[PDB]
């Protein structure tokens, strides 16, 4: 059985992790463009390379964690090291606006790469714990929703709380508040790591545990080929929408701070959909659930763009569209799990299949970031921090309505089967 203490600890750890990563995954490109003053192509290339490398370097840390064997175990020391190292790197990451000249770029690149590596170090053992720590059979289906609930909650809280803090502490210096926000994030991160370390214990240990094989496996499982292709498009679309929102709601729409309403508050609908999910699944067939998952985001985007003309930016429009998008994201995220086992049923060949999803996710995120960088650089000058020059609104609109094409492609690929 699983106690409540362990579930709470394993939810708090995930809360800390996502609470650390959200700000970097939302406000980084905006920070560089509108605060530091970097170019656009440089940011695009930096993000592309520094995310592809982090996507491809995951397996190595698996070998390192397998090899480590010492007094404290083989996961706790790595988690403890990663927490502090990543916290210090993150604090240093939001102070690039104190330099100037050639060294300014070098510092940016070095700090970003360090952040990626340290986060990977901190993250791998934390998720490697579950199969070993207290899991015999079917006791994981009860533990799994706990960490993901807090993982979803962290992003909403950060999105709803960020801007007011900087605004209160900012004024003529709009990074000095970012540094303090980073301090708060680090405090929460360290507290969560301490709690999980003190309230998680190890049981059910284990011992003793090619590219040609990979390509053979990919070719053999045609269903597996469709699974990864389906996942990639949705990941890219979601990354585009989540990343570019600040630019859209600062330039195209009147910058009256409807971004928190659009994301943070619809987070509540996300949480409700997640918490009531089993009854909804029992009520309805899986195919219709998948169709709704792929449909709702398109409705949100259609409402957004369609009402973007001849309106005063209806509040009901923004919140409703956000609710639709969050419902779709939560439903698709939960539905992803069931398909992998069915696909793979027909080295280990299951541990290998475990990492392919993460590979695809990170690759899609990097590709989306590069795409945004290039397209934004093409049309106009965003770093101006000035009134939106006309004829750039078309560029921003196409940027933010491109995801619907990826949603369409995912729907077609699924409908094929």
């Amino acid at each position, epitope marked *: 059985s699983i106690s409540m203490t362990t579930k709470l600890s394993y939810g708090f750890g995930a809360f800390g992790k996502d609470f650390a990563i959200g700000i970097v995954y939302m406000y980084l490109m905006y920070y560089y463009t509108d605060v530091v003053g970097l170019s656009v192509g440089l940011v695009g290339t930096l993000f592309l390379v520094a995310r592809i490398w982090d996507a491809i370097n995951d397996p190595i840390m698996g070998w390192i964690v397998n090899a480590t064997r010492s007094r404290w175990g083989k996961f706790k020391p790595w988690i403890l090291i990663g927490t502090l190292t990543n916290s210090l790197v993150l604090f240093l990451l939001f102070s690039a606006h104190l330099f100037e000249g050639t060294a300014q770029v070098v510092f940016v690149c070095v700090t970003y790469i360090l952040w990626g590596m340290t986060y990977t170090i901190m993250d791998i053992p934390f998720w490697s714990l579950v199969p*070993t720590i207290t*899991l*015999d*059979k079917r006791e994981r289906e009860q533990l799994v929703p706990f960490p993901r609930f807090f993982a979803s909650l962290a992003g909403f809280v950060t999105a709803g709380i960020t801007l007011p803090f900087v605004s209160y502490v900012g004024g003529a210096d709009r990074g000095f508040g970012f540094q303090m926000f980073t301090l708060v994030l680090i405090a929460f991160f360290i507290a969560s790591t301490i709690v999980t370390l003190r309230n998680v214990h190890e*049981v*059910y*240990s*284990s011992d003793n545990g090619t590219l040609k094989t990979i390509v053979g496996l990919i070719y053999k499982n045609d269903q597996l080929s469709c699974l990864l292709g389906m996942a990639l498009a949705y990941n890219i679309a979601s990354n585009i929408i989540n990343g570019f929102a600040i630019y859209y709601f600062t330039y195209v729409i009147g910058d009256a701070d409807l971004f928190p309403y659009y994301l943070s508050y619809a987070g509540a609908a996300n949480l409700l959909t997640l918490i009531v999910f089993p009854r909804l699944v029992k009520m309805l067939s899986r195919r219709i659930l998948w169709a709704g998952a792929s449909v709702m985001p398109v409705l949100s985007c259609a409402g957004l763009f369609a009402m973007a003309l001849a309106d005063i930016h209806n509040a009901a429009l923004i919140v409703a569209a956000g609710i639709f998008l969050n419902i779709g994201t939560a439903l698709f995220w939960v539905l992803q799990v069931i398909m992998v086992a069915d696909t793979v049923d027909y080295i280990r060949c299951e541990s290998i299949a475990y990492s392919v999803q993460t590979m695809v996710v990170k690759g899609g995120s990097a590709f989306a970031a590069f795409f945004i960088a290039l397209v934004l650089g093409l049309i106009g000058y965003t770093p101006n921090v000035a009134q939106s020059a006309q004829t750039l609104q078309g560029m921003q609109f196409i940027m933010i309505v491109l995801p619907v094409l990826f949603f369409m492609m995912t729907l077609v690929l699924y409908f094929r089967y």
Partner: nanobody
Amino acid sequence: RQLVESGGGLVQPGGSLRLSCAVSGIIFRDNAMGWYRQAPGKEREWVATITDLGYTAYADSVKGRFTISRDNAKDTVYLQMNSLEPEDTAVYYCHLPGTAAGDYWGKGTPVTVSS
């Protein structure tokens, strides 16, 4: 379902044995299967357990001597025993933890080691 246990016999001290707990009526990918041993004038005690993933836990007394393995192809669990001692003489049962409605113990097999 039903658990049928085999092996068993007489071995002098320092010998080795293998016990196979054939299972049926439940999809072999299922709750961990464990072993217990009971001796005259004593109660049942736990020996070892192996989960569906393949992670194994052992009792202190048998640590470093007994090993537990899971085989899905044969739908069986194997307990290898080495350096058996007179204190290790007992009847060994094949427990199927999980599914609290039915634990469904096995009859057990008697193994004795004497001079």
